PDB file of all heavy atoms in Angstrom:
ATOM      1  N   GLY H 910     -44.287  46.977  45.674  1.00  0.00           N
ATOM      2  CA  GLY H 910     -43.851  47.344  47.008  1.00  0.00           C
ATOM      3  C   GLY H 910     -42.688  46.543  47.552  1.00  0.00           C
ATOM      4  O   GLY H 910     -42.729  45.308  47.580  1.00  0.00           O
ATOM      5  N   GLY H 911     -41.644  47.241  47.996  1.00  0.00           N
ATOM      6  CA  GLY H 911     -40.448  46.594  48.494  1.00  0.00           C
ATOM      7  C   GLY H 911     -39.712  45.806  47.428  1.00  0.00           C
ATOM      8  O   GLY H 911     -40.205  45.666  46.305  1.00  0.00           O
ATOM      9  N   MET H 912     -38.529  45.291  47.766  1.00  0.00           N
ATOM     10  CA  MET H 912     -37.737  44.467  46.849  1.00  0.00           C
ATOM     11  C   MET H 912     -37.390  45.243  45.576  1.00  0.00           C
ATOM     12  O   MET H 912     -37.654  44.802  44.454  1.00  0.00           O
ATOM     13  CB  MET H 912     -38.468  43.159  46.526  1.00  0.00           C
ATOM     14  CG  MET H 912     -37.563  42.025  46.074  1.00  0.00           C
ATOM     15  SD  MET H 912     -38.462  40.481  45.813  1.00  0.00           S
ATOM     16  CE  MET H 912     -37.118  39.359  45.437  1.00  0.00           C
ATOM     17  N   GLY H 913     -36.806  46.424  45.764  1.00  0.00           N
ATOM     18  CA  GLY H 913     -36.354  47.232  44.647  1.00  0.00           C
ATOM     19  C   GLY H 913     -37.436  47.986  43.907  1.00  0.00           C
ATOM     20  O   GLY H 913     -37.267  48.285  42.719  1.00  0.00           O
ATOM     21  N   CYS H 914     -38.540  48.313  44.574  1.00  0.00           N
ATOM     22  CA  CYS H 914     -39.694  48.939  43.932  1.00  0.00           C
ATOM     23  C   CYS H 914     -39.832  50.378  44.424  1.00  0.00           C
ATOM     24  O   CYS H 914     -40.763  50.741  45.148  1.00  0.00           O
ATOM     25  CB  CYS H 914     -40.962  48.109  44.191  1.00  0.00           C
ATOM     26  SG  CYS H 914     -41.052  46.572  43.246  1.00  0.00           S
ATOM     27  N   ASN H 915     -38.866  51.205  44.015  1.00  0.00           N
ATOM     28  CA  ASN H 915     -38.812  52.629  44.346  1.00  0.00           C
ATOM     29  C   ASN H 915     -38.878  52.826  45.858  1.00  0.00           C
ATOM     30  O   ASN H 915     -38.660  51.879  46.616  1.00  0.00           O
ATOM     31  CB  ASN H 915     -39.948  53.396  43.650  1.00  0.00           C
ATOM     32  CG  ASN H 915     -39.955  53.206  42.137  1.00  0.00           C
ATOM     33  OD1 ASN H 915     -38.966  52.771  41.551  1.00  0.00           O
ATOM     34  ND2 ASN H 915     -41.074  53.549  41.501  1.00  0.00           N
ATOM     35  N   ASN H 916     -39.125  54.059  46.313  1.00  0.00           N
ATOM     36  CA  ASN H 916     -39.603  54.271  47.671  1.00  0.00           C
ATOM     37  C   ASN H 916     -40.853  55.139  47.694  1.00  0.00           C
ATOM     38  O   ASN H 916     -41.529  55.192  48.728  1.00  0.00           O
ATOM     39  CB  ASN H 916     -38.511  54.886  48.571  1.00  0.00           C
ATOM     40  CG  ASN H 916     -38.572  56.413  48.680  1.00  0.00           C
ATOM     41  OD1 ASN H 916     -39.427  56.926  49.399  1.00  0.00           O
ATOM     42  ND2 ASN H 916     -37.636  57.130  48.035  1.00  0.00           N
ATOM     43  N   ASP H 917     -41.210  55.775  46.578  1.00  0.00           N
ATOM     44  CA  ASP H 917     -42.445  56.534  46.462  1.00  0.00           C
ATOM     45  C   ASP H 917     -43.547  55.728  45.783  1.00  0.00           C
ATOM     46  O   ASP H 917     -44.511  56.307  45.270  1.00  0.00           O
ATOM     47  CB  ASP H 917     -42.189  57.837  45.702  1.00  0.00           C
ATOM     48  CG  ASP H 917     -41.436  57.622  44.395  1.00  0.00           C
ATOM     49  OD1 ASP H 917     -41.953  56.898  43.516  1.00  0.00           O
ATOM     50  OD2 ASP H 917     -40.322  58.168  44.244  1.00  0.00           O
ATOM     51  N   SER H 918     -43.413  54.407  45.754  1.00  0.00           N
ATOM     52  CA  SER H 918     -44.381  53.578  45.062  1.00  0.00           C
ATOM     53  C   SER H 918     -45.698  53.552  45.833  1.00  0.00           C
ATOM     54  O   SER H 918     -45.782  53.957  46.996  1.00  0.00           O
ATOM     55  CB  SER H 918     -43.842  52.164  44.878  1.00  0.00           C
ATOM     56  OG  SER H 918     -44.006  51.403  46.061  1.00  0.00           O
ATOM     57  N   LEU H 919     -46.737  53.051  45.161  1.00  0.00           N
ATOM     58  CA  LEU H 919     -48.096  53.124  45.690  1.00  0.00           C
ATOM     59  C   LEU H 919     -48.229  52.399  47.026  1.00  0.00           C
ATOM     60  O   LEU H 919     -48.653  52.989  48.026  1.00  0.00           O
ATOM     61  CB  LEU H 919     -49.079  52.562  44.664  1.00  0.00           C
ATOM     62  CG  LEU H 919     -50.562  52.592  45.044  1.00  0.00           C
ATOM     63  CD1 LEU H 919     -50.979  53.948  45.590  1.00  0.00           C
ATOM     64  CD2 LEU H 919     -51.405  52.218  43.833  1.00  0.00           C
ATOM     65  N   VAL H 920     -47.890  51.109  47.066  1.00  0.00           N
ATOM     66  CA  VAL H 920     -48.029  50.383  48.326  1.00  0.00           C
ATOM     67  C   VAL H 920     -46.957  50.803  49.320  1.00  0.00           C
ATOM     68  O   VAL H 920     -47.158  50.697  50.538  1.00  0.00           O
ATOM     69  CB  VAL H 920     -48.010  48.866  48.088  1.00  0.00           C
ATOM     70  CG1 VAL H 920     -49.382  48.387  47.670  1.00  0.00           C
ATOM     71  CG2 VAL H 920     -47.015  48.541  47.023  1.00  0.00           C
ATOM     72  N   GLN H 921     -45.804  51.276  48.837  1.00  0.00           N
ATOM     73  CA  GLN H 921     -44.840  51.876  49.752  1.00  0.00           C
ATOM     74  C   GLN H 921     -45.392  53.163  50.347  1.00  0.00           C
ATOM     75  O   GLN H 921     -45.175  53.451  51.530  1.00  0.00           O
ATOM     76  CB  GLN H 921     -43.510  52.134  49.044  1.00  0.00           C
ATOM     77  CG  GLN H 921     -42.370  52.497  49.987  1.00  0.00           C
ATOM     78  CD  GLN H 921     -41.545  51.299  50.412  1.00  0.00           C
ATOM     79  OE1 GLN H 921     -41.212  50.439  49.596  1.00  0.00           O
ATOM     80  NE2 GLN H 921     -41.206  51.240  51.695  1.00  0.00           N
ATOM     81  N   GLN H 922     -46.124  53.939  49.545  1.00  0.00           N
ATOM     82  CA  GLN H 922     -46.733  55.162  50.051  1.00  0.00           C
ATOM     83  C   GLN H 922     -47.776  54.856  51.117  1.00  0.00           C
ATOM     84  O   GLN H 922     -47.847  55.542  52.143  1.00  0.00           O
ATOM     85  CB  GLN H 922     -47.373  55.940  48.904  1.00  0.00           C
ATOM     86  CG  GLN H 922     -47.388  57.440  49.098  1.00  0.00           C
ATOM     87  CD  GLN H 922     -46.274  58.122  48.335  1.00  0.00           C
ATOM     88  OE1 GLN H 922     -45.700  57.552  47.410  1.00  0.00           O
ATOM     89  NE2 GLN H 922     -45.969  59.355  48.715  1.00  0.00           N
ATOM     90  N   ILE H 923     -48.600  53.833  50.885  1.00  0.00           N
ATOM     91  CA  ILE H 923     -49.649  53.492  51.840  1.00  0.00           C
ATOM     92  C   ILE H 923     -49.057  52.854  53.087  1.00  0.00           C
ATOM     93  O   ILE H 923     -49.586  53.026  54.191  1.00  0.00           O
ATOM     94  CB  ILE H 923     -50.692  52.580  51.165  1.00  0.00           C
ATOM     95  CG1 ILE H 923     -51.187  53.230  49.869  1.00  0.00           C
ATOM     96  CG2 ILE H 923     -51.862  52.292  52.109  1.00  0.00           C
ATOM     97  CD1 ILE H 923     -51.760  52.261  48.854  1.00  0.00           C
ATOM     98  N   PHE H 924     -47.953  52.119  52.938  1.00  0.00           N
ATOM     99  CA  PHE H 924     -47.295  51.512  54.091  1.00  0.00           C
ATOM    100  C   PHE H 924     -46.650  52.587  54.962  1.00  0.00           C
ATOM    101  O   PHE H 924     -46.927  52.679  56.168  1.00  0.00           O
ATOM    102  CB  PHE H 924     -46.261  50.493  53.600  1.00  0.00           C
ATOM    103  CG  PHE H 924     -45.242  50.083  54.633  1.00  0.00           C
ATOM    104  CD1 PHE H 924     -45.602  49.283  55.709  1.00  0.00           C
ATOM    105  CD2 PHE H 924     -43.923  50.492  54.522  1.00  0.00           C
ATOM    106  CE1 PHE H 924     -44.662  48.893  56.649  1.00  0.00           C
ATOM    107  CE2 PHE H 924     -42.981  50.113  55.462  1.00  0.00           C
ATOM    108  CZ  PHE H 924     -43.351  49.312  56.526  1.00  0.00           C
ATOM    109  N   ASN H 925     -45.801  53.426  54.355  1.00  0.00           N
ATOM    110  CA  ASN H 925     -45.199  54.537  55.085  1.00  0.00           C
ATOM    111  C   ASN H 925     -46.270  55.416  55.714  1.00  0.00           C
ATOM    112  O   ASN H 925     -46.113  55.893  56.844  1.00  0.00           O
ATOM    113  CB  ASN H 925     -44.303  55.356  54.155  1.00  0.00           C
ATOM    114  CG  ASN H 925     -43.192  54.526  53.532  1.00  0.00           C
ATOM    115  OD1 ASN H 925     -43.243  53.297  53.537  1.00  0.00           O
ATOM    116  ND2 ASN H 925     -42.183  55.198  52.984  1.00  0.00           N
ATOM    117  N   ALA H 926     -47.379  55.623  55.004  1.00  0.00           N
ATOM    118  CA  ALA H 926     -48.497  56.361  55.570  1.00  0.00           C
ATOM    119  C   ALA H 926     -49.189  55.589  56.683  1.00  0.00           C
ATOM    120  O   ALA H 926     -49.898  56.196  57.493  1.00  0.00           O
ATOM    121  CB  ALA H 926     -49.504  56.714  54.477  1.00  0.00           C
ATOM    122  N   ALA H 927     -49.006  54.271  56.738  1.00  0.00           N
ATOM    123  CA  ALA H 927     -49.596  53.466  57.796  1.00  0.00           C
ATOM    124  C   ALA H 927     -48.732  53.413  59.047  1.00  0.00           C
ATOM    125  O   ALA H 927     -49.256  53.131  60.132  1.00  0.00           O
ATOM    126  CB  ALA H 927     -49.866  52.041  57.302  1.00  0.00           C
ATOM    127  N   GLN H 928     -47.426  53.673  58.923  1.00  0.00           N
ATOM    128  CA  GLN H 928     -46.588  53.767  60.117  1.00  0.00           C
ATOM    129  C   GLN H 928     -47.121  54.823  61.080  1.00  0.00           C
ATOM    130  O   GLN H 928     -47.111  54.620  62.300  1.00  0.00           O
ATOM    131  CB  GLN H 928     -45.140  54.075  59.735  1.00  0.00           C
ATOM    132  CG  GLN H 928     -44.238  52.854  59.709  1.00  0.00           C
ATOM    133  CD  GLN H 928     -44.905  51.681  59.033  1.00  0.00           C
ATOM    134  OE1 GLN H 928     -45.364  50.740  59.685  1.00  0.00           O
ATOM    135  NE2 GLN H 928     -45.014  51.758  57.716  1.00  0.00           N
ATOM    136  N   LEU H 929     -47.596  55.951  60.555  1.00  0.00           N
ATOM    137  CA  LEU H 929     -48.243  56.974  61.374  1.00  0.00           C
ATOM    138  C   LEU H 929     -49.751  56.821  61.201  1.00  0.00           C
ATOM    139  O   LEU H 929     -50.398  57.543  60.444  1.00  0.00           O
ATOM    140  CB  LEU H 929     -47.772  58.372  60.986  1.00  0.00           C
ATOM    141  CG  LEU H 929     -46.268  58.632  60.889  1.00  0.00           C
ATOM    142  CD1 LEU H 929     -45.773  58.431  59.458  1.00  0.00           C
ATOM    143  CD2 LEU H 929     -45.938  60.026  61.400  1.00  0.00           C
ATOM    144  N   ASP H 930     -50.315  55.852  61.924  1.00  0.00           N
ATOM    145  CA  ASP H 930     -51.738  55.559  61.776  1.00  0.00           C
ATOM    146  C   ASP H 930     -52.600  56.592  62.494  1.00  0.00           C
ATOM    147  O   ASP H 930     -53.608  57.057  61.949  1.00  0.00           O
ATOM    148  CB  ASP H 930     -52.044  54.149  62.289  1.00  0.00           C
ATOM    149  CG  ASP H 930     -51.336  53.832  63.592  1.00  0.00           C
ATOM    150  OD1 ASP H 930     -50.532  54.668  64.054  1.00  0.00           O
ATOM    151  OD2 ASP H 930     -51.591  52.748  64.157  1.00  0.00           O
ATOM    152  N   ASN H 931     -52.221  56.970  63.716  1.00  0.00           N
ATOM    153  CA  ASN H 931     -53.060  57.900  64.466  1.00  0.00           C
ATOM    154  C   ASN H 931     -52.954  59.365  63.917  1.00  0.00           C
ATOM    155  O   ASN H 931     -53.547  60.269  64.521  1.00  0.00           O
ATOM    156  CB  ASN H 931     -52.705  57.829  65.961  1.00  0.00           C
ATOM    157  CG  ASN H 931     -52.334  56.403  66.415  1.00  0.00           C
ATOM    158  OD1 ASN H 931     -52.869  55.419  65.907  1.00  0.00           O
ATOM    159  ND2 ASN H 931     -51.407  56.307  67.381  1.00  0.00           N
ATOM    160  N   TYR H 932     -52.229  59.593  62.815  1.00  0.00           N
ATOM    161  CA  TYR H 932     -52.191  60.888  62.137  1.00  0.00           C
ATOM    162  C   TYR H 932     -52.791  60.737  60.741  1.00  0.00           C
ATOM    163  O   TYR H 932     -53.971  61.044  60.537  1.00  0.00           O
ATOM    164  CB  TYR H 932     -50.758  61.432  62.057  1.00  0.00           C
ATOM    165  CG  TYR H 932     -50.507  62.455  60.956  1.00  0.00           C
ATOM    166  CD1 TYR H 932     -51.420  63.477  60.693  1.00  0.00           C
ATOM    167  CD2 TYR H 932     -49.366  62.384  60.169  1.00  0.00           C
ATOM    168  CE1 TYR H 932     -51.193  64.400  59.689  1.00  0.00           C
ATOM    169  CE2 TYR H 932     -49.133  63.302  59.163  1.00  0.00           C
ATOM    170  CZ  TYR H 932     -50.047  64.304  58.927  1.00  0.00           C
ATOM    171  OH  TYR H 932     -49.804  65.214  57.926  1.00  0.00           O
ATOM    172  N   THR H 933     -51.990  60.291  59.768  1.00  0.00           N
ATOM    173  CA  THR H 933     -52.557  59.872  58.491  1.00  0.00           C
ATOM    174  C   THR H 933     -53.470  58.693  58.753  1.00  0.00           C
ATOM    175  O   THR H 933     -52.998  57.570  58.966  1.00  0.00           O
ATOM    176  CB  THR H 933     -51.487  59.474  57.476  1.00  0.00           C
ATOM    177  OG1 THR H 933     -50.929  58.207  57.851  1.00  0.00           O
ATOM    178  CG2 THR H 933     -50.405  60.518  57.406  1.00  0.00           C
ATOM    179  N   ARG H 934     -54.775  58.931  58.753  1.00  0.00           N
ATOM    180  CA  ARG H 934     -55.673  57.872  59.184  1.00  0.00           C
ATOM    181  C   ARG H 934     -55.723  56.739  58.162  1.00  0.00           C
ATOM    182  O   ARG H 934     -56.759  56.486  57.536  1.00  0.00           O
ATOM    183  CB  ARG H 934     -57.053  58.451  59.477  1.00  0.00           C
ATOM    184  CG  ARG H 934     -57.027  59.496  60.579  1.00  0.00           C
ATOM    185  CD  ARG H 934     -58.388  60.135  60.806  1.00  0.00           C
ATOM    186  NE  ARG H 934     -58.872  59.926  62.172  1.00  0.00           N
ATOM    187  CZ  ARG H 934     -58.753  60.813  63.158  1.00  0.00           C
ATOM    188  NH1 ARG H 934     -58.149  61.975  62.940  1.00  0.00           N
ATOM    189  NH2 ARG H 934     -59.233  60.535  64.366  1.00  0.00           N
ATOM    190  N   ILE H 935     -54.583  56.063  58.007  1.00  0.00           N
ATOM    191  CA  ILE H 935     -54.448  54.821  57.262  1.00  0.00           C
ATOM    192  C   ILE H 935     -53.906  53.784  58.233  1.00  0.00           C
ATOM    193  O   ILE H 935     -52.816  53.962  58.792  1.00  0.00           O
ATOM    194  CB  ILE H 935     -53.521  54.974  56.045  1.00  0.00           C
ATOM    195  CG1 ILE H 935     -54.157  55.890  54.995  1.00  0.00           C
ATOM    196  CG2 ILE H 935     -53.148  53.611  55.479  1.00  0.00           C
ATOM    197  CD1 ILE H 935     -55.288  55.251  54.207  1.00  0.00           C
ATOM    198  N   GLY H 936     -54.664  52.710  58.439  1.00  0.00           N
ATOM    199  CA  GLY H 936     -54.427  51.830  59.567  1.00  0.00           C
ATOM    200  C   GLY H 936     -53.257  50.870  59.480  1.00  0.00           C
ATOM    201  O   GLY H 936     -52.350  50.925  60.316  1.00  0.00           O
ATOM    202  N   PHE H 937     -53.255  49.983  58.491  1.00  0.00           N
ATOM    203  CA  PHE H 937     -52.442  48.776  58.570  1.00  0.00           C
ATOM    204  C   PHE H 937     -51.763  48.527  57.226  1.00  0.00           C
ATOM    205  O   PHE H 937     -51.578  49.436  56.411  1.00  0.00           O
ATOM    206  CB  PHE H 937     -53.326  47.607  59.028  1.00  0.00           C
ATOM    207  CG  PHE H 937     -54.166  47.930  60.231  1.00  0.00           C
ATOM    208  CD1 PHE H 937     -55.468  48.376  60.081  1.00  0.00           C
ATOM    209  CD2 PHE H 937     -53.645  47.824  61.508  1.00  0.00           C
ATOM    210  CE1 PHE H 937     -56.239  48.690  61.182  1.00  0.00           C
ATOM    211  CE2 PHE H 937     -54.413  48.133  62.614  1.00  0.00           C
ATOM    212  CZ  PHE H 937     -55.711  48.566  62.449  1.00  0.00           C
ATOM    213  N   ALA H 938     -51.376  47.277  56.995  1.00  0.00           N
ATOM    214  CA  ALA H 938     -50.622  46.919  55.805  1.00  0.00           C
ATOM    215  C   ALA H 938     -51.524  46.925  54.569  1.00  0.00           C
ATOM    216  O   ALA H 938     -52.728  46.673  54.668  1.00  0.00           O
ATOM    217  CB  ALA H 938     -49.983  45.543  55.978  1.00  0.00           C
ATOM    218  N   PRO H 939     -50.955  47.196  53.381  1.00  0.00           N
ATOM    219  CA  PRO H 939     -51.788  47.399  52.182  1.00  0.00           C
ATOM    220  C   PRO H 939     -52.283  46.135  51.480  1.00  0.00           C
ATOM    221  O   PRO H 939     -53.321  46.180  50.809  1.00  0.00           O
ATOM    222  CB  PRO H 939     -50.862  48.207  51.263  1.00  0.00           C
ATOM    223  CG  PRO H 939     -49.494  47.795  51.662  1.00  0.00           C
ATOM    224  CD  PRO H 939     -49.549  47.570  53.148  1.00  0.00           C
TER     225      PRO H 939
END
């Protein structure tokens, strides 16, 4: 995640999905 690690990467996916917490019910940092 981050530091040149794609943008569709696993923890990048969960982080981007965490920016919209009250929609994609994923809360916080991975």
Side-chain angles (χ1 to χ4, degrees):
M912 203 176 185
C914 286
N915 304 343
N916 95 77
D917 50 60
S918 81
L919 181 48
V920 278
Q921 192 93 43
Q922 210 100 18
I923 307 157
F924 163 71
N925 301 16
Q928 261 44 256
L929 310 93
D930 43 355
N931 324 327
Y932 158 43
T933 73
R934 299 176 120 97
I935 292 285
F937 312 94

